[PDB]
C-alpha cells in the first residue's frame, strides 16, 4: 500500500491508477475519511473555511495589485466613458509583432487585457482615486489573508479547537451573524460611504490622514443625538452635479431621492448610504430574536416543536407538524449546506437581475461588455449554486435523514407524496415544452412560407400590467404608479412618496434598462425559461426524493450517493444514483442559463444597436435566433484572425474554437463507455510489455476511468466548453462592436 | 386600456404588409379577416392580448373546444382501459383493438364532462392511496 491518500486505506491499497483519481475526488468528503469523528469533522471544516476566506482575500488583493501596477485607473478616472479599463499586462513570449501591436491599446505602450469585471467603476464609486490607494488596499488584503490563515492554524491547536457543542449552538451563531456579521458590517459600509465615498464624489479628499477631523456633514453628530435627522437630508446633490467635483454638489449625507444620478446614470450614493443604514438597523434588530444566555429570546426547538396556538390544539405552524426538525437541521451539515447554496443562488440571480436595470456604479451602465459579462457571470453562478443545493439535499436524504426521528413531520409527508410531486412536475414540464416548441415551430413555418402575419403572437399582458403598475406609461394602462391620481401614487394618508419623482423618471427613461419594453418574443422566451426551470427542478427533485430508493432499486440508500449502477439485471440500471440525477440536471441547468443569457444578450444588443425592431420581429421564431443573433453577430468574432491579419479579437477567436474543442471532447467521455477503453488499454499493456528498449514500467496498473469518473469528466469538459465558447462569443460580439 | 395595440385595419405597417403580399388563396381572405378582426402591434403583425373584457369569446371558444376534444380522447381511453381490465388477457386487447368496446367507449365519452363529474362525486374517479403500488420511502 501507499501513504497517499492518507484518509482512505481502501484507496491506498488500490494497485491501479484509479487510486490517484479517486484520491482527488474524495479528499474533501471528510465524513467518509477513515476514523472520522463528528468533532474532528467540524474542526477540519472550520479550518478549511478559514483557508477559503484567506484565498478569497488573496484573490481580491491580486486584482487590486495588478490594476494598481499595470492598469490605467487614474487615466480612466478623467474619462470613464471613453477610456478602456486595463485588467493586467500581457507577457506571452511567443506572440508575433502583429499580435503585440493588436493588443497594445487603451493608451498603453505594452500589450494589455481590457478589464470587463467592472472593478474600475466599483472602486471609482466608493471613493478610490489613486493607484497608491489601490496598492494600500492590496497590501491590507494580503495582511488580512495572513491573519485568517494564522487563525485557521490556531483553531486547530489543541487548546483552541472548539468543542462539538460550540459548533452545535445555533441560536448564538444566528444572533451574531444577523446582528454583527450582517448588521454591523452594513453599518460600517454606510459609515465608509458617508465619511469617504460621498465627499470624494463631491471633489473632497478624505483619507486616513484627515478623516478624524473632517466631519461628513456640517450639522455634525449633534443632529443625530438631538433627533434632528432631517438635517442630514437637506440640500441633496442637484441634477446638474458632476461626479468627482464640487460643481452642483450638495451637502446631504442621507437622502431618498430615488432613480439615477443624471450624469453617471447610476444610483445616488446618499441613497445607498441610507439604504445600508436602514439595513444595518433592521439586521441588528433581527439579531436579538433568539435566546442565548439571558433567558429572553425565542428557542428555535420550542417553536418547531410547539403544538398549541394560544390554547387551541394545532399540529404546528400553519397547522403543519414541524416537530423534530431542529435536530434534523442541526445534526445534518448537508441540510444546512443545501439552504446555504439555495440562498446564495437566489441572491446571485437577484444580483444579476437588479444590477443591469439599477446600476449602482458610476458609468457602469454605459460599459455594455461589462454589463453583459457581469449578468452572465452571476446567472451562471446562481445556476450552479441551485444545482449544488439540490445535490446536497439528496446527500442529506441518503446520509443524514432517519425516519423515526422525523415521523409525522412535513419532511416525512413530502417523502410520502413524492410520487405526486414528481408526476405533477413532469406534467408541467411536458405542457410547457410541447406548447412552447409547437408555437415556435409554427411561427418558423409561417415566416418561412412568407406569412409572418400568421404567427401566433401572444402578448405578455400580465408582465406589461406589472410594468404599468410600477410606473411605465408606455402601454397605456392607467393603474397604480402609472396613474397620478391613484391611491398608491398619491399615498393619500401621508404623501411620503419621496421616491416617486426620481423612480418615475428612471422608469420612463427610454435610454436605460429599467423595465425594458416587452412583446410576444419576450413572452415566448419567458415561457421557455419557465420550461427550463421546471425541467431542471424536476430532475433535481426526482433525484433527491428517489435517493433513498425506488421500485427499481428499493435499497438505494445502502449504496451511497454516487455509484455507477446496479448491473444489467432487472432491465438495466444505468444512471440510477442521485449523483447521476445531479449529473443529468447540470446539462439542463446549462441549457436553461444558455436560454436566459441568449435572451438578455440579444435584447441588449438590439437596444445598443438602435435596432430594437430586429429583436422585436425576429425573436418570435427560432430561425430568427439562429440567424440574427448567432450567425449575424459571429462575424467579427470569427474574423479576429484570418489570412489577411490579426486584431485584438484574436484571443476570443482562438478561445471560441478552444471551447468548441473541449465541448467536442466531452462527447467522447459521454457517448463511449468504459469497457471499450479497458480492452484497448489491455492491448496497449501487451504492446508495452513486449517492446524492447522501453525500460519504463507502470507502478500503478493503467485502467480505464470508472463509470462515475467518466460521467464527471465528460460533464466537466462539456461545462468548460460551454462557458468558454459563450464567454468568448459574448465578449467579442459586445466589445469588438462597441466601446 | 391598452394603447400600443390598434385594430389591424388602422395599422399602416399592416396595410403595407397587405399590399406587398402575393395574390394567392393563402393571403387575400386571411388578410381581410385579420384587418377586420385582429389587433396589430407596431410591427404590423396581429397580436393576441388577454387583457380585454370584450372579445372574450375569442379566447373561450378555442380553449373550450380543445378542452372538450382532449377530455373526449382521454375519457375514451380511460373507459376502454377500465373495460379491458375485467378480461383475462388485457394486453392482447391493448395490442388488438376491440372494436365494439372502443365504439361503446367513444359513444359514452361523447358526454365526458358529466360522466367525469358523476364519477368524482361517487368516488369512482380515483383509487385510494393504499391500493396503489409505491416505492419504499
Amino acid at each position: 500500500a501507499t501513504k497517499f491518500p492518507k484518509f482512505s486505506q481502501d484507496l491506498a491499497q488500490d494497485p491501479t491508477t484509479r487510486r490517484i483519481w479517486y484520491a482527488m475526488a474524495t479528499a474533501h468528503d471528510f465524513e467518509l475519511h477513515d476514523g472520522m469523528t463528528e468533532e474532528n469533522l467540524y474542526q477540519k471544516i472550520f479550518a478549511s473555511h478559514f483557508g477559503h476566506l484567506a484565498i478569497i482575500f488573496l484573490w481580491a488583493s491580486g486584482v487590486l495589485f495588478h490594476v494598481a501596477w499595470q492598469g490605467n485607473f487614474e487615466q480612466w478616472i478623467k474619462d470613464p466613458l471613453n477610456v478602456r479599463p486595463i485588467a493586467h499586462a500581457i507577457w506571452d513570449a511567443q506572440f508575433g509583432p502583429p499580435a503585440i501591436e493588436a493588443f497594445t491599446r487603451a493608451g498603453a505602450t505594452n500589450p494589455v487585457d481590457i478589464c470587463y469585471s467592472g472593478v474600475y467603476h466599483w472602486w471609482y464609486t466608493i471613493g478610490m482615486r489613486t493607484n497608491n490607494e489601490l496598492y494600500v488596499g492590496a497590501i491590507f488584503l494580503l495582511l488580512l489573508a495572513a491573519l485568517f490563515l494564522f487563525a485557521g492554524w490556531l483553531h486547530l491547536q489543541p487548546r483552541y479547537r472548539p468543542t462539538l457543542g460550540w459548533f452545535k449552538s445555533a441560536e448564538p451563531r444566528l444572533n451574531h451573524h444577523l446582528a454583527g456579521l450582517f448588521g454591523v458590517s452594513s453599518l460600517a459600509w454606510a459609515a465608509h460611504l458617508i465619511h469617504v465615498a460621498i465627499p470624494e464624489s463631491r471633489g473632497q479628499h478624505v483619507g486616513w490622514d484627515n478623516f478624524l477631523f473632517t466631519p461628513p456633514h456640517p450639522a455634525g453628530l449633534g443632529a443625530f443625538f438631538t433627533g434632528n435627522w432631517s438635517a442630514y437630508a437637506q440640500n441633496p446633490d442637484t441634477a446638474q452635479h458632476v461626479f468627482n467635483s464640487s460643481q452642483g454638489a450638495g451637502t446631504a449625507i442621507l437622502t431618498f431621492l430615488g432613480g439615477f444620478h443624471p450624469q453617471t446614470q447610476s444610483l445616488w450614493l446618499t441613497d445607498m448610504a441610507h439604504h445600508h443604514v436602514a439595513i444595518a438597523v433592521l439586521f441588528i434588530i433581527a439579531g436579538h430574536m433568539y435566546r442565548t444566555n439571558w433567558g429572553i429570546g425565542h428557542s428555535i426547538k420550542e417553536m418547531l416543536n410547539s403544538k398549541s396556538f394560544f390554547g387551541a390544539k394545532v399540529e404546528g405552524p400553519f397547522n403543519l407538524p414541524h416537530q423534530g426538525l431542529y435536530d434534523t437541521i442541526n445534526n445534518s451539515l448537508h441540510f444546512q449546506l443545501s439552504f446555504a447554496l439555495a440562498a446564495l443562488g437566489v441572491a446571485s440571480s437577484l444580483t444579476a437581475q437588479h444590477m443591469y436595470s439599477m446600476p449602482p456604479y458610476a458609468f457602469i451602465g454605459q460599459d455594455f461588455t461589462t454589463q453583459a459579462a457581469l449578468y452572465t457571470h452571476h446567472q451562471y453562478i446562481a445556476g450552479f449554486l441551485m444545482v449544488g443545493a439540490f445535490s446536497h439535499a439528496g446527500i442529506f436524504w441518503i446520509r443524514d435523514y432517519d425516519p423515526e426521528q422525523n415521523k409525522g413531520n412535513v419532511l416525512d409527508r413530502m417523502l410520502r407524496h413524492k410520487e405526486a410531486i414528481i408526476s405533477h412536475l413532469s406534467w408541467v414540464s411536458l405542457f410547457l415544452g410541447f406548447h412552447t416548441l409547437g408555437l415556435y415551430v409554427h411561427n418558423d413555418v409561417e415566416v418561412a412560407f412568407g406569412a409572418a402575419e400568421k404567427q401566433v403572437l401572444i402578448e405578455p399582458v400580465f408582465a406589461q400590467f406589472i410594468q404599468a403598475a410600477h410606473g411605465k406609461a408606455l402601454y397605456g394602462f392607467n393603474t397604480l404608479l402609472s396613474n397620478p391620481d391613484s391611491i398608491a401614487s398619491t399615498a393619500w394618508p401621508n404623501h411620503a412618496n419621496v421616491w416617486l419623482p426620481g423612480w418615475l423618471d428612471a422608469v420612463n427613461n427610454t435610454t436605460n434598462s429599467l423595465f425594458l419594453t416587452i412583446g410576444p418574443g419576450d413572452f415566448y422566451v419567458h415561457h421557455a425559461i419557465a420550461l427550463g426551470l421546471h425541467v431542471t427542478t424536476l430532475v433535481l427533485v426526482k433525484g433527491a426524493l428517489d435517493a433513498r430508493g425506488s421500485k427499481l432499486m428499493p435499497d438505494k440508500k445502502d449504496f451511497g450517493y454516487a455509484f455507477p449502477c446496479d448491473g444489467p439485471g432487472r432491465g438495466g440500471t444505468c444512471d440510477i444514483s442521485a449523483w447521476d440525477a445531479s449529473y443529468l440536471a447540470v446539462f439542463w441547468m446549462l441549457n436553461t442559463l444558455g436560454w436566459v443569457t441568449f435572451y438578455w444578450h440579444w435584447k441588449h444588443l438590439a437596444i445598443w444597436e438602435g435596432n430594437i425592431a430586429q429583436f422585436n420581429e425576429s425573436s418570435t421564431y427560432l430561425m430568427g435566433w439562429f440567424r440574427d443573433y448567432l450567425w449575424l453577430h459571429s462575424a467579427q468574432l470569427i474574423n479576429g484572425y484570418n489570412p489577411y491579419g490579426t486584431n485584438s479579437l484574436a484571443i476570443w477567436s482562438w478561445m471560441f474554437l478552444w471551447g468548441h474543442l473541449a465541448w467536442a471532447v466531452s462527447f467522447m467521455f459521454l457517448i463511449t463507455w468504459r469497457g471499450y477503453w479497458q480492452e484497448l488499454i489491455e492491448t496497449l499493456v501487451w504492446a508495452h510489455e513486449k517492446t524492447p528498449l522501453s525500460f519504463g514500467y507502470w507502478r500503478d496498473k493503467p485502467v480505464a476511468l470508472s463509470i462515475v469518473q467518466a460521467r464527471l469528466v465528460g460533464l466537466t469538459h462539456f461545462t468548460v466548453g460551454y462557458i468558454a465558447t459563450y464567454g468568448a462569443f459574448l465578449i467579442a460580439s459586445t466589445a469588438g462592436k462597441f466601446g | 386600456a391598452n394603447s400600443t395595440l390598434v385594430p389591424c385595419s388602422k395599422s399602416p405597417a399592416f396595410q403595407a404588409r397587405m399590399k406587398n403580399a402575393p395574390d394567392t388563396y393563402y393571403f387575400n381572405k386571411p388578410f381581410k379577416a385579420y384587418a377586420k378582426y385582429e389587433l396589430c402591434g407596431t410591427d404590423g403583425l396581429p397580436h393576441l392580448p388577454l387583457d380585454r373584457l370584450d372579445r372574450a369569446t375569442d379566447v373561450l371558444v378555442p380553449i373550450g373546444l380543445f378542452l372538450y376534444v382532449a377530455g373526449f380522447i382521454g375519457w375514451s381511453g380511460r373507459s376502454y382501459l377500465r373495460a379491458t381490465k375485467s378480461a383475462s388477457d388485457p394486453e392482447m386487447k391493448e395490442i388488438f383493438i376491440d372494436l365494439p368496446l372502443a365504439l361503446q367507449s367513444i359513444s359514452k365519452a361523447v358526454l365526458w364532462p358529466l360522466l367525469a363529474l358523476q364519477e368524482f362525486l361517487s368516488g369512482d374517479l380515483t383509487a385510494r392511496d393504499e391500493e396503489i403500488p409505491i416505492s419504499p420511502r
Binding site: N319, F465, A469, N478, T479, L480, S486 | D51
Partner: peptide, 29 residues
C-alpha cells in the same frame, strides 16, 4: 371532508388573485 383550513387558505389566495385581476381589468382603481 370539507378541509376547513385548506379551503380557507385557498379562498384567501384566490380572493387575492381576483382582486389583482379586478385591478388589472380596470374594474376597480
Amino acid at each position: 371532508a370539507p378541509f376547513p383550513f385548506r379551503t380557507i387558505v385557498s379562498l384567501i389566495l384566490l380572493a387575492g388573485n381576483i382582486l389583482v385581476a379586478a385591478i388589472y381589468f380596470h374594474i376597480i382603481n
